[PDB]
Scaffold this motif. Structure first.
Motif, PDB file in Angstrom:
ATOM      1  N   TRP A  78      -5.926   0.902   8.448  1.00 43.42           N
ATOM      2  CA  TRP A  78      -6.798  -0.391   8.000  1.00 43.42           C
ATOM      3  C   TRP A  78      -8.137  -0.061   8.785  1.00 43.42           C
ATOM      4  N   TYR A  83       4.698  -8.907  17.566  1.00 41.12           N
ATOM      5  CA  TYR A  83       3.436  -8.766  18.395  1.00 41.12           C
ATOM      6  C   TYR A  83       2.576  -9.120  18.913  1.00 41.12           C
ATOM      7  N   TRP A  91      -8.254  -0.837   3.389  1.00 46.78           N
ATOM      8  CA  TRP A  91      -8.113  -0.415   3.223  1.00 46.78           C
ATOM      9  C   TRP A  91      -8.825   0.835   2.472  1.00 46.78           C
ATOM     10  N   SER A 120      -5.965   6.552   5.455  1.00 44.93           N
ATOM     11  CA  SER A 120      -5.128   6.158   6.040  1.00 44.93           C
ATOM     12  C   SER A 120      -4.815   5.240   7.240  1.00 44.93           C
ATOM     13  N   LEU A 148       2.969   7.489   1.651  1.00 45.60           N
ATOM     14  CA  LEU A 148       1.508   7.491   2.190  1.00 45.60           C
ATOM     15  C   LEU A 148       1.553   7.742   4.262  1.00 45.60           C
ATOM     16  N   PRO A 149       1.026   7.947   4.900  1.00 46.40           N
ATOM     17  CA  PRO A 149       1.293   8.698   6.765  1.00 46.40           C
ATOM     18  C   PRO A 149       1.223   7.115   6.678  1.00 46.40           C
ATOM     19  N   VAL A 150       0.534   6.236   6.385  1.00 47.08           N
ATOM     20  CA  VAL A 150       0.740   4.992   7.386  1.00 47.08           C
ATOM     21  C   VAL A 150       2.298   4.445   7.198  1.00 47.08           C
ATOM     22  N   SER A 191      -6.259  -0.266  12.249  1.00 47.01           N
ATOM     23  CA  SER A 191      -4.936  -0.396  13.462  1.00 47.01           C
ATOM     24  C   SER A 191      -3.830   0.630  12.865  1.00 47.01           C
ATOM     25  N   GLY A 192      -3.542   0.307  14.463  1.00 53.31           N
ATOM     26  CA  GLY A 192      -2.472   1.696  14.683  1.00 53.31           C
ATOM     27  C   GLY A 192      -1.014   1.636  13.879  1.00 53.31           C
ATOM     28  N   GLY A 193       0.220   2.357  13.998  1.00 53.29           N
ATOM     29  CA  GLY A 193       0.882   2.682  13.698  1.00 53.29           C
ATOM     30  C   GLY A 193       2.020   1.217  13.953  1.00 53.29           C
ATOM     31  N   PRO A 194       2.425   0.613  15.591  1.00 48.13           N
ATOM     32  CA  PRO A 194       2.809  -0.271  15.733  1.00 48.13           C
ATOM     33  C   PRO A 194       2.513  -1.352  16.034  1.00 48.13           C
ATOM     34  N   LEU A 234       1.218  -0.887   0.482  1.00 47.78           N
ATOM     35  CA  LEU A 234       0.278   0.040   0.063  1.00 47.78           C
ATOM     36  C   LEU A 234       0.675   1.302  -0.387  1.00 47.78           C
ATOM     37  N   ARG A 294       3.957   6.540  10.411  1.00 47.64           N
ATOM     38  CA  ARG A 294       3.477   5.888  11.348  1.00 47.64           C
ATOM     39  C   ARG A 294       3.946   4.701  11.379  1.00 47.64           C
ATOM     40  N   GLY A 295       4.475   3.622  10.203  1.00 51.74           N
ATOM     41  CA  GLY A 295       4.066   2.190  10.120  1.00 51.74           C
ATOM     42  C   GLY A 295       2.837   1.714  10.330  1.00 51.74           C
ATOM     43  N   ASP A 296       2.794   0.423   9.966  1.00 48.27           N
ATOM     44  CA  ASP A 296       1.852  -0.746   9.964  1.00 48.27           C
ATOM     45  C   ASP A 296       1.807  -1.757  10.668  1.00 48.27           C
TER      46      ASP A 296
END
Ligand SMILES: *[C@@H]1O[C@H](CO)[C@@H](O[C@@H]2O[C@H](CO)[C@@H](O)[C@H](O)[C@H]2NC(C)=O)[C@H](O)[C@H]1NC(C)=O
Ligand SMILES: *[C@@H]1O[C@H](CO)[C@@H](O[C@@H]2O[C@H](CO)[C@@H](O)[C@H](O)[C@H]2NC(C)=O)[C@H](O)[C@H]1NC(C)=O
Ligand SMILES: *[C@@H]1O[C@H](CO)[C@@H](O)[C@H](O)[C@H]1NC(C)=O
Ligand SMILES: *[C@@H]1O[C@H](CO)[C@@H](O)[C@H](O)[C@H]1NC(C)=O
Lengths: 508, 230
Positions: free
Chosen positions: B145, B37, B164, B143, A269-271, B211-214, A246, A274-276
């Motif tokens: 998920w 995770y 998404w 931006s 992208l901002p993701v 879904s967040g960043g980390p 993405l 920010r990381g996903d």
């Protein structure tokens, strides 16, 4: 003459290999009989292995250091022709089963490399008394020499092959050689054979992709220098291994190192920053964005929705020039810089937006985006920009956030003179100075189609009139350094080649 | 999937005591990138689950230091040195390293701005289709998920898929691969979840976590219980 570089692979590749440009890496059944000369070292690691015709070991490569004849742990190994190892030191170590080799000396097969000659486990050489060492010293080496010191074109021995290009005193210039011969291995070749390329040295090679690139100027492929980053087709976000990616996260990053022509469409992208968590990728380091500085073409749409806040422009796309819209965001846009914190647009290279339109919105602190004339960038008539919701034009003009007056009204990507689609006066490469250094300045350049081109460094500046009419040593009008005929040159040609590689004294 | 077995189950803890819930995974929770995770989601009774330890041993912003976590390989645990009325609820040892996320059995601890607004609860019939909406406001909708977690009553949370909004790409779970449809309306910023072919055991609370960043499911929807029976 067959030329080559597990055991079965080399067994069936060395079956002939009359001459090896690489190394005799016979490692771990009598498949080789006629390996005349090897242009490298011989990694021989075995009892019955003839190696009879191995004459010369040139040591172009080594196992560890000056390891020309590296052995370990071969009584029936008659390397009787191995009587001169050139530019290498015999590493004849750990020979427990080798017989008849102890009686014969191991140093005459080497020249001037006895310091690196260690060996541990009149006189016959190999297995069987029928063979002898054939002393010749105590320019032929191993025994019109059969094998030359450096280069043997057909029968004669030469230290250097006739160069592919030859100085011509008739034209007062260093010209090409009508008798030009490519130095392939140890034999000069009028034309580079075996579908090989023309390397910078002149030594034909089948892989010149390191720090260079392949270019066809004549009927033979020729390897030239990699001008900056050279072409590298690379998959983009949505095409290839990134088909379902993405954005350019910390996973698909690096995969974009030296990726010049992105074959897909980048998805900043901002993701990404920010990381996903779902796609198992950590936050993208802003310093990792410099990997994308190599991009010079995107056959898709470059969508940018987030940039590091410490960056005031798109520095990672300062070399991006093409955004050919083979794939377009929302079917209309190719450049989609949206909701960034860029003070200047920064795409100081972007010159060809072929198919899609441009949307530049949400850039609360970007003013120069509206200043650019985007009819020049567009490649088709069905394109129209959507530059709205940027920083206010009136406030931008009032605060002085307008680019240099030393720029054409055509527009500008930023305040610096580097960022300007066109400049009022002439331009000095990336930038555009007030004027070329025609009479005042250190570069002392000259005007060429409204562009400053620095004159050849070996011509002295002229303080009365223009320093040089055109680029190159010939067109320079003042030359404190020496001059060859009517042209300028570094120094007089002394060690040059003539009809028979004669040293042309030329003049004083 | 990965069996996220929890050593304690419905463990009751008196206030002001060092509660410890240990959860073990069938497979090693270690991803290629090297980050484990593992997350512990607080789900208050009748409330949307909220994250506590965004990593094996990290902490979510807004969650007090009283919550802790520690573990390696397949064995993990959560430490609560001081426990108050707030810590009451169900803790779900979540794993994200494996392609399909899987929650734990559910250790119901007892005693011995951005908001995603969902739809209303509905009761349908088996074999029908129930569209579940999730309005998103307060953040850039295209931006993040839009995950679609579910919680079958009498069972731990079961992942069902995500979507998404930027491109509409969806990743349905294997159990829901050919049964559900996750769509969205970008212009007006909601993502729907049309679950076709409803069954008796398909009753659940379809949280639309984000879904967040980390970490996964940074934010959540109120929960749309969909009771289906004949
Ligand atoms: C991070 O980039 C990786 C690829 O480098 C993406 O991971 C892919 O995800 C898809 C499904 O979404 C899988 O089919 C691929 O196998 C994955 N590739 C790898 C190498 O693991 C990922 O989607 C990207 N993340 C974001 C947020 O864009
Ligand atoms: C986003 O853009 C704003 C406005 O351009 C940046 O604001 C400036 O930041 C610098 C760096 O500290 C200050 O010296 C200026 O005074 C700021 N200008 C104003 C009036 O806002 C801001 O820094 C950018 N975002 C971040 C967090 O870096
Ligand atoms: C591109 O640059 C990288 C820098 O790490 C280098 O490793 C790679 O070989 C280069 N690729 C070329 C020159 O084709
Ligand atoms: C070049 O610069 C000079 C000095 O500023 C200026 O007078 C002249 O008009 C410029 N030439 C152009 C704009 O063609």
């Amino acid at each position: 003459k067959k030329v080559c570089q597990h055991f079965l692979s080399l067994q069936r590749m060395f079956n002939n290999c009359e001459v090896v440009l690489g190394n005799l890496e016979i490692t771990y059944l009598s498949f080789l009989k006629t390996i005349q000369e090897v242009a490298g070292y011989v990694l021989i690691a075995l009892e019955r292995i003839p190696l009879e015709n191995l004459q010369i070991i040139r040591g172009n490569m080594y196992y560890e250091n000056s390891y020309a004849l590296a052995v370990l742990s071969l009584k029936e190994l008659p390397m009787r022709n191995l009587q001169e190892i050139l530019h290498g030191a015999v590493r004849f170590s750990n020979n427990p089963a080798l017989c008849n080799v102890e009686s014969i000396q191991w140093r005459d097969i080497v020249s001037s490399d006895f310091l690196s000659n260690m060996s541990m486990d009149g006189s016959c050489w190999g297995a069987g008394e029928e063979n002898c060492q054939k002393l010749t010293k105590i320019q032929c080496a191993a025994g019109d020499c059969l094998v030359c010191r450096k280069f043997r074109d057909e029968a004669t021995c030469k230290d250097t092959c006739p160069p592919l290009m030859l100085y011509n005193p008739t034209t007062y210039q260093m010209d090409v050689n009508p008798e030009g011969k490519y130095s392939f291995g140890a034999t000069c070749v009028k034309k580079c054979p075996r579908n090989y390329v023309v390397t910078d040295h002149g030594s034909c090679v089948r892989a010149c992709g390191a720090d260079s690139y392949e270019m066809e100027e004549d009927g033979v492929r020729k390897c030239k220098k990699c001008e900056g980053p050279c072409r590298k087709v690379c998959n983009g976000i949505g095409i290839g291994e990134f088909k379902d990616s993405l954005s350019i996260n910390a996973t698909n990053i690096k995969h974009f190192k030296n990726c010049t022509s992105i074959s897909g469409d980048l998805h900043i992208l901002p993701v990404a920053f920010r990381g996903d968590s779902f796609t198992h990728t950590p936050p993208l380091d802003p310093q990792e964005l410099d990997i994308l500085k190599t991009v010079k073409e995107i056959t898709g749409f470059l969508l940018i929705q987030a940039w590091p806040e410490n960056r005031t422009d798109l520095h990672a796309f300062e070399n991006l020039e093409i955004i050919r819209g083979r794939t377009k965001q929302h079917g209309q846009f190719s450049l989609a810089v949206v909701s960034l914190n860029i003070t200047s647009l920064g795409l100081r290279s972007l010159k060809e937006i072929s198919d899609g339109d441009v949307i530049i919105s949400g850039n609360k602190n970007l003013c120069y985006a509206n200043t650019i004339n985007w009819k020049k960038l567009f490649g088709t008539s069905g394109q129209k920009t959507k530059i709205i919701s940027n920083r206010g034009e009136n406030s931008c003009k009032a605060t002085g956030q307008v680019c240099h007056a030393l720029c054409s009204p055509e527009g500008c990507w930023g305040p610096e003179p580097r960022d300007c689609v066109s400049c009022r006066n002439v331009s000095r490469g990336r930038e555009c100075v007030d004027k070329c250094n025609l009479l005042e300045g250190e570069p002392r350049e000259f005007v060429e189609n409204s562009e400053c081109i620095q004159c050849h460094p070996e011509c002295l500046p002229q303080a009365m009139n223009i320093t040089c009419t055109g680029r190159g040593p010939d067109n320079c009008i003042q030359c404190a350094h020496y001059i060859d005929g009517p042209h300028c040159v570094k120094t007089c040609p002394a060690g040059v080649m003539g009809e028979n590689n004669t040293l042309v004294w030329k003049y004083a | 999937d990965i069996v996220m077995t929890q050593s304690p189950l419905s463990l009751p803890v008196t206030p002001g005591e060092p509660a410890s819930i240990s959860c073990r995974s069938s497979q090693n929770i270690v991803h290629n990138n090297g980050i484990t995770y593992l997350e512990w989601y607080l789900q208050k009774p009748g409330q949307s689950p909220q994250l506590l330890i965004y990593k094996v041993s990290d902490r979510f912003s807004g969650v007090p230091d009283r919550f802790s976590g520690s573990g390696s390989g397949t064995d993990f645990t959560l430490k609560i040195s001081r426990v108050e009325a707030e810590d009451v609820g169900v803790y779900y040892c979540f794993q994200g390293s494996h392609i399909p996320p899987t929650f734990g059995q559910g250790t119901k601890v007892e005693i011995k701005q951005v908001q995603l607004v969902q739809s209303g609860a509905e009761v349908k019939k088996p074999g029908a289709s129930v569209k579940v909406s999730c309005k998103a406001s307060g953040y850039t909708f295209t931006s993040y998920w839009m995950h679609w977690v579910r919680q079958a009553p009498g069972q731990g949370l079961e992942w069902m898929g995500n979507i998404w909004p930027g491109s509409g790409g969806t990743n349905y779970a294997e159990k829901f691969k050919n049964r559900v449809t996750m769509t969205r309306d970008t212009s007006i910023s909601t993502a729907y979840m049309e679950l076709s072919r409803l069954r008796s055991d398909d009753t659940a609370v379809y949280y639309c976590a984000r879904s967040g960043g980390p970490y996964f499911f940074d934010y959540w929807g109120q929960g749309t219980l969909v009771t289906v029976s004949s």
